[PDB]
Design an enzyme around this catalytic site. Structure first.
Site, short mmCIF file in Angstrom:
data_model
loop_
_atom_site.label_atom_id
_atom_site.label_comp_id
_atom_site.label_asym_id
_atom_site.label_seq_id
_atom_site.Cartn_x
_atom_site.Cartn_y
_atom_site.Cartn_z
N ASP A 222 27.99 -3.88 0.23
CA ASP A 222 28.69 -4.37 1.42
C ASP A 222 28.47 -3.42 2.59
O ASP A 222 29.39 -3.13 3.36
CB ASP A 222 30.18 -4.56 1.15
CG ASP A 222 30.86 -5.48 2.16
OD1 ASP A 222 30.19 -6.39 2.69
OD2 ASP A 222 32.07 -5.29 2.43
N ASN B 194 31.72 -0.48 7.81
CA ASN B 194 31.80 0.45 6.69
C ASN B 194 31.02 1.74 6.96
O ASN B 194 30.64 2.44 6.02
CB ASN B 194 31.30 -0.22 5.40
CG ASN B 194 32.25 -1.30 4.92
OD1 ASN B 194 33.37 -1.40 5.40
ND2 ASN B 194 31.80 -2.10 3.96
N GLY C 240 42.45 -4.57 2.52
CA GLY C 240 43.73 -3.97 2.20
C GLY C 240 44.38 -3.40 3.44
O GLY C 240 43.74 -3.23 4.48
N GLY D 229 44.61 -6.93 5.77
CA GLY D 229 43.92 -8.18 5.53
C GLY D 229 42.44 -7.98 5.23
O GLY D 229 41.83 -6.98 5.60
N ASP E 151 33.73 -0.76 15.68
CA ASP E 151 34.70 -0.71 16.77
C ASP E 151 34.13 0.00 17.99
O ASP E 151 34.51 -0.32 19.12
CB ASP E 151 35.98 -0.02 16.30
CG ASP E 151 36.74 -0.83 15.27
OD1 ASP E 151 36.64 -2.08 15.31
OD2 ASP E 151 37.43 -0.22 14.43
N1 LIG Z 1 39.06 7.05 5.96
C1 LIG Z 1 39.37 6.48 7.15
N2 LIG Z 1 39.56 7.23 8.25
C2 LIG Z 1 39.86 6.68 9.45
N3 LIG Z 1 39.99 5.36 9.64
C3 LIG Z 1 39.83 4.50 8.62
C4 LIG Z 1 39.50 5.02 7.28
N4 LIG Z 1 39.40 3.96 6.47
C5 LIG Z 1 39.64 2.85 7.21
N5 LIG Z 1 39.90 3.17 8.49
C6 LIG Z 1 40.20 2.22 9.59
O1 LIG Z 1 41.15 1.26 9.13
C7 LIG Z 1 40.73 -0.07 9.45
C8 LIG Z 1 40.79 -0.92 8.20
O2 LIG Z 1 39.63 -0.59 7.44
P1 LIG Z 1 39.11 -1.53 6.24
O3 LIG Z 1 39.95 -2.78 6.22
O4 LIG Z 1 38.98 -0.68 5.00
O5 LIG Z 1 37.65 -1.92 6.80
P2 LIG Z 1 36.45 -2.35 5.82
O6 LIG Z 1 37.06 -3.45 4.97
O7 LIG Z 1 35.37 -2.83 6.75
O8 LIG Z 1 36.13 -1.07 5.09
C9 LIG Z 1 39.30 0.01 9.97
O9 LIG Z 1 39.23 -0.53 11.29
C10 LIG Z 1 38.93 1.48 9.98
O10 LIG Z 1 38.48 1.87 11.28
#
Ligand SMILES: Nc1ncnc2c1ncn2[C@@H]1O[C@H](COP(=O)(O)OP(=O)(O)O)[C@@H](O)[C@H]1O
Length: 286
Positions: A144, A149, A30, A27, A101
């Site tokens: 962003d 991020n 993605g 959500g 987090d």
């Molecule tokens: N490359 C990665 N390695 C480890 N955890 C990740 C990675 N990318 C995303 N995550 C985890 O997956 C969850 C979903 O991330 P995402 O929806 O992409 O967050 P944002 O939209 O803020 O980038 C996040 O809580 C993040 O901690």
């Protein structure tokens, strides 16, 4: 280490048929899955949301930016998958997840960040954005930047992520005109509401909010005005109580707070460049 074109069946079985057991986020941007590839690689797999036009722009936005560059403070994009209405992106897995987090821990448990760690995260985050702003031609505007991020690897080093809204700006330009007010509430520069234009100075403003989070420990959604209004009163009460409970000697914090204030200036011309932010962090070390 080139960018790999990964087969869709590989990602299908690696995520157990996109099972919910490996789903670590969905959500908003993605679906993200923690997976082990058939070669043993521990990865994060982003199953893109709304591929029909909106997600394919975000797909190429990452392919054009984070997929073409490598930097120690940027999340590594290891692979991709293009199949009809299915867009997938594959990253190296970051052990401790997002900075957001950790600051707002789940049920107040996990890993704790002392000031020596948070400063290294702030320096590392700054170096990644400076690379986008200075070393990249065309320049890259993240659009962003926020604590969610900023990913933390095995060594709690910062790696900037989520280039889904990033845009390429020419070095011969001072701004880039867009069509949508991207960004998260709490991090939007005040001048972004005035025109459909983004800039590197905008990313600097958003970085300043992140540096405030590493100093205050609070959520932006506000936080920027609260620190400024209390900056004229008692600045010793705006910092994180855990940072003050460690040692009242580093209250160094105001030197970094000056950097966060300078980044959070309402006038984009008064904000420092991320190259200047790094040099300001170097002067505090001396
Ligand atoms: N490359 C990665 N390695 C480890 N955890 C990740 C990675 N990318 C995303 N995550 C985890 O997956 C969850 C979903 O991330 P995402 O929806 O992409 O967050 P944002 O939209 O803020 O980038 C996040 O809580 C993040 O901690």
């Amino acid at each position: 280490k080139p960018l790999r074109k990964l087969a869709f069946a590989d990602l299908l079985q690696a995520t157990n048929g996109f099972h919910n057991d490996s789903l670590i986020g969905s959500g908003g941007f993605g679906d993200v899955y923690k997976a082990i590839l058939k070669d043993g690689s521990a990865v994060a797999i982003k199953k893109l949301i709304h591929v029909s036009g909106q997600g394919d722009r975000e797909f190429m936005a990452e392919m054009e930016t984070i997929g073409k560059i490598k930097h120690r403070n940027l999340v590594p994009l290891l692979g991709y998958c293009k199949v009809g209405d299915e867009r997938l992106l594959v990253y190296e897995f970051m052990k401790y997840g997002s900075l957001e987090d950790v600051l707002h821990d789940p049920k107040k448990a996990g890993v704790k960040l002392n000031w020596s760690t948070r400063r290294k995260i702030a320096i590392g985050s700054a170096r990644g954005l400076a690379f986008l702003h200075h070393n990249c031609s065309p320049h890259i505007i993240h659009r962003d930047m926020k604590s969610s991020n900023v990913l933390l690897d095995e060594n709690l080093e910062a790696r900037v992520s989520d280039f889904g809204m990033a845009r390429l700006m020419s070095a011969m330009d001072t701004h880039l005109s867009v069509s949508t007010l991207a960004g998260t509430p709490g991090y939007v520069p005040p001048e972004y509401y005035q025109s459909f234009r983004c800039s590197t100075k905008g990313d600097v403003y958003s970085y300043g909010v992140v540096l405030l989070e590493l100093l205050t420990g609070k959520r932006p959604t506000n936080l920027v005005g609260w620190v400024k209004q209390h900056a004229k009163l008692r600045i010793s009460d705006v910092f994180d109580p855990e940072l003050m409970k460690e040692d009242p000697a580093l209250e160094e914090l105001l030197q970094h707070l000056k950097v966060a204030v300078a980044c959070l200036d309402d006038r984009a011309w008064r904000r420092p460049t991320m190259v200047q932010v790094m040099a300001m962090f170097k002067e505090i070390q001396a």
